[model samples]
Target: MIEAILFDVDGTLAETEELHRRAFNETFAALGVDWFWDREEYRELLTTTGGKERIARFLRHQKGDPAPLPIADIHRAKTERFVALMAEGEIALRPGIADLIAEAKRAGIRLAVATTTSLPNVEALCRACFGHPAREIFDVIAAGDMVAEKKPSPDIYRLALRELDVPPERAVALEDSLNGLRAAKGAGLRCIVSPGFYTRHEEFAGADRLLDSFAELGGLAGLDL
Candidate 1:
């Protein structure tokens, strides 16, 4: 009875998570901040929900360091640098994204994006990868600022369900990590986990499905509603 498929953008439908991590590291290093989130370390940090909150946690992890910037300022600086790097083509969507999107459209299934990423980040990625009409394809996009809490809290997915007009039984969430899987499941939606390179080791106990990649899902022809 599923009528819609909700997706997490970064790491789920795209390969931008690591790129964003690298950008954060490089930006902090360039700013002489002495904070670095190496690839392996960034994977652990993904447990945090929002990007800014993740960055804040990372900063707090360095409490012994001198001159720790305010969380808000640090997050703003990171976001600006991350967006700039993304605009410079430092990131791209994962394989089969456009194909799946087209298939969903043709299959009469609503498509929505539910993520802890900021709206600006979502818009930027969509514009870069799917062109100007990208936003039109998404029936609902519930982003970070729209909810008081983030992934693992179910607020974001609940908001997405409300906006997409889909019942819990009639929607499936595509996620990449434990937090995301928990969020979808907690919201009462079925979930499919397609682990990102960084999240492959995380537990996905609540997910209804797990696949090596979106390519294995067989697009619209196999969805069978």
Candidate 2:
């Protein structure tokens, strides 16, 4: 029996990667970095987990040996831009997500967030999508800054499980990328993959299930949890 549901924010709840890409590019320009990641480039970078790490990875791959960049400051600016975009209602919850969340609440199932995004990013997203009551909706929010390791490491999901006080067997994770699936599975939780814009071509070999969108499964009840 499922008692808790863990969610990955960016791609799982909403198709916000495009906005993220825009934010990253905008930040790079604002910071006087000539870097601009198009869709394919951003998709490749998505393999790296956190915003700071992604920036570092990209810089490492530059043609010449690049100087150490101010990753934290750049990421902060990117996050601010992303948050502003979200506030403008540029993103929307994926089909069936709102309904599933509501149904879970009615069923007394715990809700948690386990993601490699910063806490501010998470809060911003929730406020943008669900308003001020966002914090009230989720029982636990284990974000990137809270954990030493990011997705594909399982640290965040483990932390979320611990905070929610729910064993992995009693919880299900909704994820959008292969990294998120591996993280959830490594933490001993079953995962359902709902591929988003950047992850549609990625393989989710270990996922317990896959769907184009949450709507494809007809909401939480259809999961038979």
Predictions in order: lDDT: 0.80, 0.87
List, residue by residue over 10-84, the lDDT tens digit for candidate 1. 898788877778767776776686677887788788888798788777666575455356766766777787778
Model 2: per-residue Cα lDDT over 1-225, one tens digit each: 879999999998888888889988887777675678989888889999998999889887877434335778778888999888888865788998999998899999999999998888888888888876457879999987799888899999999999999999889999999999999999999898889989999988877888887887676776664
- What TM-score does model 1 achieve against the real structure? 0.91
Candidate 2 local Cα displacement, residue 194, angstroms? 1.0
The regions of model 1 sitting more than 4 angstroms off are none
TM-score of each: 0.91, 0.95
Q: What are the clashing pairs of model 1?
A: none
What global local distance difference test value does model 2 have?
0.87
lDDT of 1: 0.80
Candidate 2 collision pairs: none
